[PDB]
C-alpha cells in the first residue's frame, strides 16, 4: 500500500525512583501511532490503568521509532485487537498482506472503521504477529497466498489527472482496454 499514516514506536519507561522504590519496574510498550506525541500518550494511558504510574510521576527512557527492516517483501500480519462498541468490548483477530507492519496497521485501522465503525482511540492493539502462508485462516488472504495469482482488469475506469480530465470527450470510451490514456 501507500503511506500508512502510522509510525511504529517501541517506547520504554518507568517511574521516577522514589526512596522507597529506588529501582521501579521498567515497561516496554509497542505503539502504532501517527506520531511520537500520540505514541507516548498511549504509553502513559497504559502505564496508568495497568501499573498506577502517571505521566507526571513516570519517566521515559526510550522511544525508538522502528523502521521496517525489508519493505520489499510481502508479509501476512495477523493483528489481535480489542475495541469498544456502543455496547461493551469485543476481541478481534484480523490479518492483512502488506510489505510493512505499519502498513498492515493502517490497513487494520481503516478496515475496522469501515466494517465496524471503530475509531483509533477506541481500538487497542493486542499483540501483532507475522504468519507463514500456511497459517493464514481467512479466505480473502488464502486466495492471494498462491504463487501465481492472475486476474484481468475488466470494468476499469482509467484514472487520470485533472490536467486532462476530458469534460466533453468527443471520442468513445471503452471500459475494457489497457488504459494508457
Amino acid at each position: 500500500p501507500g503511506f500508512s499514516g502510522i509510525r511504529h514506536y517501541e517506547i520504554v519507561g518507568r517511574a521516577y525512583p522514589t526512596e522507597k522504590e529506588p529501582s521501579p519496574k521498567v515497561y516496554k510498550m509497542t505503539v502504532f501511532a501517527k506520531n511520537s506525541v500520540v505514541g507516548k500518550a498511549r504509553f502513559w494511558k497504559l502505564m496508568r490503568k495497568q501499573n498506577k504510574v502517571k505521566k507526571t510521576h513516570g519517566q521515559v527512557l526510550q522511544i525508538r521509532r522502528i523502521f521496517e527492516k525489508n519493505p520489499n517483501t510481502i508479509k501476512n500480519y495477523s493483528i489481535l485487537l480489542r475495541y469498544q462498541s456502543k455496547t461493551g468490548v469485543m476481541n478481534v483477530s484480523k490479518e492483512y498482506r502488506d510489505t510493512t507492519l505499519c502498513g498492515a496497521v493502517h490497513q487494520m485501522y481503516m478496515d475496522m472503521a469501515g466494517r465496524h465503525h471503530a475509531r483509533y482511540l477506541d481500538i487497542d492493539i493486542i499483540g501483532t504477529t507475522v504468519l507463514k502462508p500456511s497459517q493464514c485462516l481467512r479466505p480473502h488472504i488464502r486466495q492471494f497466498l498462491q504463487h501465481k495469482v492472475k486476474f484481468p482488469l475488466l470494468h476499469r475506469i482509467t484514472k487520470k489527472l485533472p490536467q486532462h480530465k476530458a469534460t466533453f470527450l468527443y471520442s468513445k470510451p471503452s471500459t475494457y482496454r489497457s488504459g494508457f490514456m
Binding site: 506520531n35 511520537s36 506525541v37 500520540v38 507516548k40 500518550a41 482511540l121
Partner: peptide, 14 residues
Amino acid sequence: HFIEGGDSGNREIY
C-alpha cells in the same frame, strides 16, 4: 486535543 487529532494541549516537538 493534539493527541485527538486536534490542535490543543502539548505538541511536545510539533
